[PDB]
Amino acid sequence: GAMAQRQRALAIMCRVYVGSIYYELGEDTIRQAFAPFGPIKSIDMSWDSVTMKHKGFAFVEYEVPEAAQLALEQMNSVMLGGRNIKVGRPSNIGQAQPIIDQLAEEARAFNRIYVASVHQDLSDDDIKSVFEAFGKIKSCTLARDPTTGKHKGYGFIEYEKAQSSQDAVSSMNLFDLGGQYLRVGKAVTPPMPLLTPAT
């Protein structure tokens, strides 16, 4: 049971602070450019209505924190136009840091990774099948929704070996599987599909 709430810090981890961006990119296009990492649930975008441009920052909040840490991980280079963007400001100072670090350790215990841009037609087992070809997998769980008829486009995979899961991250990253580039990254917190502590 435990009932130790870490989800408050996760609500922070689901967000990525994107700084600078570029004086051009709008809210809708930014959603499209960050979607590769995960489905964006909310965006706080800087927009000045008198100049019709913006030089500031924006908060990209995904459903899962993985895509946020992941978008930070891979895309801390540029974001269109020609600007070195800043993703996140986790200067290892704060109350959330210890929590993030703890769950990081918890993700290590599960040997779990995150995969995005998972082609709509490919099911959990198929993603496991190909990743299994590189590392010894333990479990496959795509974010699948009963009221869509398919999976939402992102998922998570968990290995029996923390080494093997990192192999998949390197090999399967930007792998075209079904006409889509699987975005793979390290899972920062264990996504519990069945939170049933009495089963």
UniProtKB/Swiss-Prot annotation:
Annotated positions of the Phosphoserine modification: 129
N6-acetyllysine carried by residues: 136
Annotated ranges, domain RRM: 14-92, 111-189
Residue positions, PTM Phosphothreonine: 199
Tissue-wise expression: Isoform 2 is expressed in colonic epithelium and colorectal epithelium cancer (at protein level). Isoform 6 is expressed in colorectal epithelial cancer but below detection level in colonic epithelium. Expressed in heart, brain, placenta, lung, liver, skeletal muscle, kidney, pancreas, spleen, thymus, prostate, testis, ovary, small intestine, colon and peripheral blood leukocytes.
Localization per Swiss-Prot or TrEMBL: Nucleus
Assembly description: Homodimer. Associates with the spliceosome. Found in a complex with RO60 and Y5 RNA. Found in a complex with FUBP1 and far upstream element (FUSE) DNA segment. Interacts directly with ERCC3. Interacts with CDK7 and GTF2H1. Interacts with SRSF11/P54. Does not interact with ERCC3 in xeroderma pigmentosum complementation group B (XPB) cells. Interacts with ARGLU1; interaction may be involved in ARGLU1-mediated modulation of alternative splicing.
Purpose of the protein: DNA- and RNA-binding protein, involved in several nuclear processes such as pre-mRNA splicing, apoptosis and transcription regulation. In association with FUBP1 regulates MYC transcription at the P2 promoter through the core-TFIIH basal transcription factor. Acts as a transcriptional repressor through the core-TFIIH basal transcription factor. Represses FUBP1-induced transcriptional activation but not basal transcription. Decreases ERCC3 helicase activity. Does not repress TFIIH-mediated transcription in xeroderma pigmentosum complementation group B (XPB) cells.
Stated family: Belongs to the RRM half pint family.
Implicated disorder: Verheij syndrome: A syndrome characterized by growth retardation, delayed psychomotor development, dysmorphic facial features, and skeletal, mainly vertebral, abnormalities. Additional variable features may include coloboma, renal defects, and cardiac defects.
Note from the entry: Does not repress TFIIH-mediated transcription in xeroderma pigmentosum complementation group B (XPB) cells.
Domain notes: The third RNA recognition motif, called PUMP domain, is atypical and may rather mediate homodimerization and/or protein-protein interactions.
Name of this chain's protein: Poly(U)-binding-splicing factor PUF60
UniProt source species: Homo sapiens
